[PDB]
Design an enzyme around this catalytic site. Structure first.
Site, PDB file in Angstrom:
ATOM      1  CG  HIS B  41      -0.599   0.104   2.508  1.00 50.88           C
ATOM      2  ND1 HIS B  41       0.123   1.190   2.968  1.00 50.88           N
ATOM      3  CD2 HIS B  41      -0.839  -0.730   3.548  1.00 50.88           C
ATOM      4  CE1 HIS B  41       0.356   0.952   4.255  1.00 50.88           C
ATOM      5  NE2 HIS B  41      -0.194  -0.195   4.647  1.00 50.88           N
ATOM      6  N   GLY B 143       2.163   6.118   9.558  1.00 49.82           N
ATOM      7  CA  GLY B 143       3.587   6.071   9.257  1.00 49.82           C
ATOM      8  C   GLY B 143       4.287   4.865   9.865  1.00 49.82           C
ATOM      9  CB  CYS B 145       2.382   0.838   7.290  1.00 55.50           C
ATOM     10  SG  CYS B 145       0.757   1.391   7.845  1.00 55.50           S
TER      11      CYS B 145
HETATM   12  C1  LIG Z   1      -1.715   6.906   2.187  1.00 59.85           C
HETATM   13  N1  LIG Z   1      -1.770   5.472   2.363  1.00 59.85           N
HETATM   14  C2  LIG Z   1      -2.425   4.838   3.403  1.00 59.85           C
HETATM   15  C3  LIG Z   1      -2.263   3.470   3.579  1.00 59.85           C
HETATM   16  C4  LIG Z   1      -2.841   2.829   4.660  1.00 59.85           C
HETATM   17  C5  LIG Z   1      -3.624   3.538   5.569  1.00 59.85           C
HETATM   18  N2  LIG Z   1      -4.375   2.820   6.559  1.00 59.85           N
HETATM   19  C6  LIG Z   1      -5.694   2.322   6.187  1.00 59.85           C
HETATM   20  C7  LIG Z   1      -5.617   0.982   5.500  1.00 59.85           C
HETATM   21  C8  LIG Z   1      -6.664   0.319   4.804  1.00 59.85           C
HETATM   22  C9  LIG Z   1      -6.269  -0.868   4.261  1.00 59.85           C
HETATM   23  S1  LIG Z   1      -4.596  -1.193   4.599  1.00 59.85           S
HETATM   24  C10 LIG Z   1      -4.452   0.264   5.465  1.00 59.85           C
HETATM   25  C11 LIG Z   1      -3.881   2.453   7.778  1.00 59.85           C
HETATM   26  O1  LIG Z   1      -4.527   1.796   8.585  1.00 59.85           O
HETATM   27  C12 LIG Z   1      -2.447   2.868   8.091  1.00 59.85           C
HETATM   28  N3  LIG Z   1      -2.181   2.784   9.509  1.00 59.85           N
HETATM   29  N4  LIG Z   1      -1.656   1.639  10.013  1.00 59.85           N
HETATM   30  N5  LIG Z   1      -1.688   1.697  11.315  1.00 59.85           N
HETATM   31  C13 LIG Z   1      -2.249   2.901  11.677  1.00 59.85           C
HETATM   32  C14 LIG Z   1      -2.488   3.467  12.926  1.00 59.85           C
HETATM   33  C15 LIG Z   1      -3.069   4.728  12.984  1.00 59.85           C
HETATM   34  C16 LIG Z   1      -3.425   5.407  11.818  1.00 59.85           C
HETATM   35  C17 LIG Z   1      -3.192   4.849  10.567  1.00 59.85           C
HETATM   36  C18 LIG Z   1      -2.588   3.598  10.522  1.00 59.85           C
HETATM   37  C19 LIG Z   1      -3.775   4.916   5.404  1.00 59.85           C
HETATM   38  C20 LIG Z   1      -3.182   5.560   4.329  1.00 59.85           C
END
Ligand SMILES: CNc1ccc(N(Cc2ccsc2)C(=O)Cn2nnc3ccccc32)cc1
Ligand SMILES: CNc1ccc(N(Cc2ccsc2)C(=O)Cn2nnc3ccccc32)cc1
Lengths: 304, 304
Positions: B41, B143, B145
């Site tokens: 992603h 951030g 991830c």
């Molecule tokens: C721009 N790209 C993007 C990529 C991923 C995310 N998302 C949503 C998501 C849906 C399906 S897979 C990921 C996340 O969940 C990231 N993330 N991870 N752990 C987190 C803890 C707190 C806040 C956010 C968090 C958001 C933006």
């Protein structure tokens, strides 16, 4: 989101751990620049620990009696000296893995990470708090002495604790990196009981703020209190008296959540008076006091 | 003595963390040998996450679009490919800090350490368990991830988890290092609810054994039970069914303490039925399930 008892990354400290042997005793040492720091009781046998005369025991030791091994390489010891309850072994090689570091003597209520070691090798890392009675509730077995506590500000490692002993109560005592014990403890196998273990009120409030930030809000109530009223309750429950300094340190958490410090004190008061009623806060069924307000902000912002 | 939620020393993993940027998205990557592993992603914007066609999005990306930075040095990307939900970026330099490593897909109930990272930099380390519903209860912010979960057998790092997402429930989902999600989760910002979070019974029993070893014995009773009787109680309390394999794995803990596994099950049964009555076990007011029997033996023996 999510809130965990997080330790600092231990890599910079792992690069400093060495094994120190004197006679039949082996413990851990901390190699920074050209000095290895270790508990002075490395010169003792278990027989000596009842009433050791460290100055007299040390006179019978020469540089060659201190065997210092960094992984599988032997360090040459060119000097030794006792500073309070630590020995400082001057070696002929500066540790190439020495990070930017400071020696700090922490305050009770402050938190730190411990890298538990055996025979100079790291076994694990966990987060601690220096208790208000100057003990730490760690996880240490025989051979763990010399394992250190530290904090990290970006690239600087502030060493605050060196493990020396386990009290008959199962709690732990040690020194700062200048060899001075926290609390009244002495490096002698004698009757030493810890004082009252009070709860670190400012940390419990910080953890309540962390709970609200992370979505656990059931404990919020319609009440407020005053510092004097709250402190009457804190006294009854063996909680540390809350001061205006503590309120000030909680300021950023108060600003972020919009919950005034005295209102959070009133939530804490009801929790003390009524208990959790079988409910949980951040996965705990008791009031957690081993996160400082700084820890809560650090974890909830993502400082690396 | 003392028992703590201990993480493995994170140094060997800290040496693998890098920052990966694709367009406006920055997350963490894992550099092992000449490959950098990261969540696929990274090629998405928040706009794309609603229904991403990863194969189509990746066609618009070339090697030069993946910016990989190890501390302050830029890695040259000479290849890219998608394996399940991870991207593998072939770089022209083998990581000099690559430890001995394996990629393992863990079982629910198993524990691991997470090195939370932001922008390729480590912020902290904590111990986790893969929940029976294949989520982890972590501490991750935007951030984070690409931050990884791992275990360490002396010098070998077994990577088991890579962080991908936070479910609307505040719990966390991710993949093994082959990019396969644990559980039914998909890397799409959609309605995904976790199943029943059951308690890892074998771990609770292991933790009760750790409590007896460390001196907390109030919960020991005069009773015994059978696997079938215990399991009727475990079902009522959303605890995992205990099997003979679980009893066998608790064998060493049983042998060390002299408390037969079924007798500990009877203590656990009474604790489930009667609660703690305001008492604590190893400083917890609830039954802890994030220590495996292996973790208890490791911590209580001092493995480095
Ligand atoms: C721009 N790209 C993007 C990529 C991923 C995310 N998302 C949503 C998501 C849906 C399906 S897979 C990921 C996340 O969940 C990231 N993330 N991870 N752990 C987190 C803890 C707190 C806040 C956010 C968090 C958001 C933006
Ligand atoms: C041969 N030299 C020796 C030196 C020290 C110890 N003692 C007793 C003691 C008295 C005053 S200062 C230290 C310790 O407490 C060591 N230690 N530390 N943490 C421990 C956890 C579990 C078991 C032992 C532990 C014993 C032997």
């Amino acid at each position: 989101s999510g809130f965990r008892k997080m330790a600092f990354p231990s890599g910079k400290v792992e690069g400093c751990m060495v094994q120190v042997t004197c006679g039949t005793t082996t413990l851990n040492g901390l190699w920074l620049d050209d000095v290895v720091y270790c508990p002075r009781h490395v010169i003792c046998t278990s027989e000596d620990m009842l009433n050791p005369n460290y100055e007299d025991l040390l006179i019978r030791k020469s540089n060659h009696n201190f065997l210092v091994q960094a992984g599988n390489v032997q360090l040459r010891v060119i000097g030794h000296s006792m500073q309070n309850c630590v020995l400082k072994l001057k070696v002929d090689t500066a540790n190439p893995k020495t990070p930017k570091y400071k020696f700090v003597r922490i305050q009770p209520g402050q938190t730190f990470s411990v890298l538990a070691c055996y025979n100079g090798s790291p076994s694990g890392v966990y987060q601690c708090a220096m208790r208000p009675n100057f003990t730490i509730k760690g996880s240490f077995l025989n051979g763990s002495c010399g394992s250190v506590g530290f904090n990290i500000d970006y690239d600087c490692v502030s060493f605050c604790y060196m493990h020396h002993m386990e009290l008959p109560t199962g709690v732990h005592a040690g020194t700062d990196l200048e060899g001075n014990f926290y609390g009244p403890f002495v490096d002698r196998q004698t009757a030493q009981a810890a004082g009252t273990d009070t709860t670190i009120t400012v940390n419990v409030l910080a953890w309540l703020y962390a709970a609200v930030i992370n979505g656990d809000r059931w404990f919020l109530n319609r009440f407020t209190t005053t510092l004097n009223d709250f402190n009457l309750v804190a006294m009854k429950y063996n909680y540390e008296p809350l001061t205006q300094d503590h309120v000030d340190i909680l300021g950023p958490l108060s600003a972020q959540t919009g919950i005034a410090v005295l209102d959070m004190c009133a939530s804490l008061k009801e929790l003390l008076q009524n208990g959790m009623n079988g409910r949980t806060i951040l996965g705990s069924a008791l009031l957690e006091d081993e996160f400082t307000p700084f820890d809560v902000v650090r974890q909830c912002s993502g400082v690396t």
